[PDB]
Write a protein that binds this ligand. Sequence first.
Ligand SMILES: Nc1nc2c(ncn2[C@@H]2O[C@H](COP(=O)(O)OP(=O)(O)OP(=O)(O)O)[C@@H](O)[C@H]2O)c(=O)[nH]1
Ligand SMILES: [Mg+2]
Lengths: 154, 47, 56, 846, 82
Amino acid sequence: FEPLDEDWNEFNDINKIIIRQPIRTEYKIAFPYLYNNLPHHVHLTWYHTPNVVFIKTEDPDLPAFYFDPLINPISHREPLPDDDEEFELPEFVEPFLKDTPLYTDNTANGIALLWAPRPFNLRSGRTRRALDIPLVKNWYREHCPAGQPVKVRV
Amino acid sequence: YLFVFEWDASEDTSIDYNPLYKERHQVQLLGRGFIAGIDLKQQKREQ
Amino acid sequence: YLTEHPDPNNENIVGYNNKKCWPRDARMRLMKHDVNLGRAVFWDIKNRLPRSVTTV
Amino acid sequence: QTLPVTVYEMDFLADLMDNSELIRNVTLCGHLHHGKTCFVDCLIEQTHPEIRKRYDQDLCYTDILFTEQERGVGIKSTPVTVVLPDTKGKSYLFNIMDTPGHVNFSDEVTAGLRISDGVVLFIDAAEGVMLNTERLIKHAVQERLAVTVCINKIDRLILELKLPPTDAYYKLRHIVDEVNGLISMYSTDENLILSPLLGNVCFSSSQYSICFTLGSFAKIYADTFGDINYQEFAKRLWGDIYFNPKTRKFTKKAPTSSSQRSFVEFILEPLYKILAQVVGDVDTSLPRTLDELGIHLTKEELKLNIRPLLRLVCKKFFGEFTGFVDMCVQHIPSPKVGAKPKIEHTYTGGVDSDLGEAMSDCDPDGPLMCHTTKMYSTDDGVQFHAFGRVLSGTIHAGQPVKVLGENYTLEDEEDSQICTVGRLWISVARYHIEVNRVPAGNWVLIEGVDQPIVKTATITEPRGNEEAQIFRPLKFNTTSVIKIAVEPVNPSELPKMLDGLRKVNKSYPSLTTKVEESGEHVILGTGELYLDCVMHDLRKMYSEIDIKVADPVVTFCETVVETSSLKCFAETPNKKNKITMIAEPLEKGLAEDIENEVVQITWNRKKLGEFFQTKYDWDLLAARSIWAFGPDATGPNILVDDTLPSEVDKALLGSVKDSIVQGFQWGTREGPLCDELIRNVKFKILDAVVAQEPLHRGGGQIIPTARRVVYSAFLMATPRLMEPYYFVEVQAPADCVSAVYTVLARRRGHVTQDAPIPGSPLYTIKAFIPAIDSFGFETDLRTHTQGQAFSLSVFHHWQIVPGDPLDKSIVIRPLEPQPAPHLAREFMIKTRRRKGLSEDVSISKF
Amino acid sequence: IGVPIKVLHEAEGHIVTCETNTGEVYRGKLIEAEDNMNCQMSNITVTYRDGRVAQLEQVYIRGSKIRFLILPDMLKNAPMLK
Ligand SMILES: Nc1nc2c(ncn2[C@@H]2O[C@H](COP(=O)(O)OP(=O)(O)OP(=O)(O)O)[C@@H](O)[C@H]2O)c(=O)[nH]1
Ligand SMILES: [Mg+2]
């Protein structure tokens, strides 16, 4: 972008400054008030989002809830009362929803659509006129791929 | 501490002589995620 | 100099004429002793001239 | 006054404060972003009908700052006062403090644990135990509070990992076992075993409003089917216990090979089936599932998206959050019962005094004793409000009060003032309820006492209460090492900044502002984001001017390695009395035993000496002759006597040592290298010629003399410098770990531990780094690893800088990163140049 | 369950005074109460029919013999009664 000459003081003495690692521009951008003189119209960015650990399913014949071995194995090894004080439930007591199965055919697809981009994570909405839907916006919005020429980066 | 229809090469950014930033070490995302549009067999070859 | 004209906040740094055509390692470095000495020199020269006769 | 619509009357909350048994003072804490403020949002939605979450955004009802909204992280600990019902239906009054989970704001937790009795630790079920959780378990045990653990984000075990049920049970059991291990490491109490059978561990998911213990879900069974003792049924839903459908019993042996555990069979799999039928089968089999569970919805409610519909189904199913209330009542004491260890721990002068016995009963009338720790700003920033708890008596609006500071003693009576209480509030997050009286046991917001308060204060009565002493200051969990220098842009606007510099010193507990001898204004901090918030709040709220900030540097310290070659003797300028010393370094690990209060002065010379002669194998002539440690509060520098009684009369020596200890305490700070403090040294007095006349034994002769003796003994025994080292934990995917090893290779660091997280595809990297190299480290990782790896860093220890700080033969080229032998000389010369000393110091200077 | 039992559990921890069928008045802090009126109370001032005042520190009253209880006055703003 186009832009929107300092004397030697007691304050900017380079004999007082320890030069160990070079300070860059992204240090000024991530922390706008620590390393910046005259920080006029900066905006405070988002800090951090927790790591979404969603793992994609490649085989439809596998069950929807499965120990996918990208997950690391858990290492294996309390006031438990005795069996003599016999607690007995009434006969009509059941666990909840025992007739329904644990997973169906639409379970893994329903979980995979929960982490879909807009509007594929939705199930209802309004229509949009066809010239207001960019199809290229993510592609130049993400980053530049490696090995591209100069003019494509520009 | 102290007309031209093309774009010129002097307008370029990311000309930085850093070992961390030239090789930015892109992600592959658990061997499951894919970069969109670039060919999937070619992405499985360059992993 | 600091007897008649004290400086509690070191304000004689702001307003010091300095050569901008040279780089910063080339032009005058504004250390506090040197700025106070220059203010003292110019005041001692200014005291010798009556302002009704001539003025610096 | 105007107030939002609340499910209970405010006169009920006004009348409920007068009973000190029905109150709980609870601090919620945990690691960064493990679901604290969202659980507080769920509690506010439970207590308020007109406050609801947006469909796309988090509420953050207790995040009221603009920085807390723009950054997305918690900054300041915020209180709230609510009334909640338990399982059986009894109303309780909760004072809940939301503390920020970031490590650099750990000082915001220490100010929160001074005025509370119980700790609720939130732990992510996906990530498990992290750095700040491990630090807060230690900080909650060492402050002597009861600890309960709530496991948040169990839906990530459902919708993200897609994990089998008994493996998720194994994950939860591993998390609880790690909590029990971290408790048993620090606690001496063997009765602190955490288990869900005791009602001590609660399970929760904050995003979809899920919260249950064993007892609440057993109460759900008792409300669904009936005729079930739910308190007995909840005693057998954890561990290796099995439901046998033949005899209808709970047996520890396997009925079949495919028999699941009772926690999987009764609790966890119905949760999986509810989430599965809501998410995957909303169109086909959801009305049958909702008709079986007994939940009816509107047709307009059935057209919502997946996440608000799942939150609505879990909210209509589980209902009110009674298990959290049951846990915080069963395992956290009332302020009447739990007052005695609080007075024993925090009140100076002991519990055995007259005022300690009066505060030990939480008497709502009598001596008014209050302890204020937090200072809040207004919307205008021109005045502050004090915030604390009422230990004894009832505080009133308009009453004259006596504010006592941290420098107050009964001998001095200097740090005290008489002020007038303007208003009194009880604090909710986004509004404040004004009252005219607050009894004992509650929290209180006081207007009109903010002028003598710096960090903490004690509120007493003006007339009577003559033996009132102050409470202890806040003992923080870390030490701020980052130095930054500030100046104003216009030098004429210097008294404006000096206004704001003493205002941000009030709202920030661990902030340290000072003025150097060269005129530089130095602020101490613990990290980058901390001083970023310091600069934001400072400028935008207290300065409205432009402020120049210098390059950040870390705080250095001084030490020795060898024993001095020659005895160091010096006389007073009265030329009658001489002091001679040899300086030596301490053994490995004793400094930390001083710092962590294992070794203590004030002891009556027996157990003290037996510790030295038992563990570190000190002689009896050496253990019985130690006198003092550090500058000020017990710094790890030690005064030792070696004067034999055959040559030096100890009855005359015992009169001058009251001046020697002042000499040492004032000489062990601002040492001769670069005016800093000492680390890991002992100071051994060998010869002493003591004056006979009392006028030659003045302190003005001998205290700068002993200062010069200290300085000579330090300069002769090969002096070195020490720098702070940070502990770093890196959370990264399976391939970015090598990139982390690549990045840490250039900042003089080393990786100590690389451990796979059980139950998660992420790894943990535990390493050490120099704090002077840790500027921009997080940005380097989050740029080189595409933002995937995340890292947090805390202060850990001190180590010796390589190089000679006295080698004048080394020439230093400016503006260049110097290699390893040049480091100590560069650091020492540049700190002397910055602080304003001479360009060198000599061996024969003192 | 009914409304007065929720009010009885609401008054736990406070000082109530109960009169039973034997004409004896027991005043003190209510510790525990159940669905039925079995009341565990502590620090009890005891008034008999003739007028003797006693100090009994732990009392457990069966709910069958109770005429009535007397509750604190600030329960009119309790949520179940509104
Ligand atoms: N999956 C899931 N995410 C959650 C849950 N609870 C909170 N989160 C999300 O995690 C992120 C952080 O939640 P916060 O409550 O802001 O985290 P925090 O603990 O307040 O962080 P601090 O500011 O350190 O207190 C937000 O996006 C939340 O929506 C939960 O139960 N499940
Ligand atoms: Mg938070």
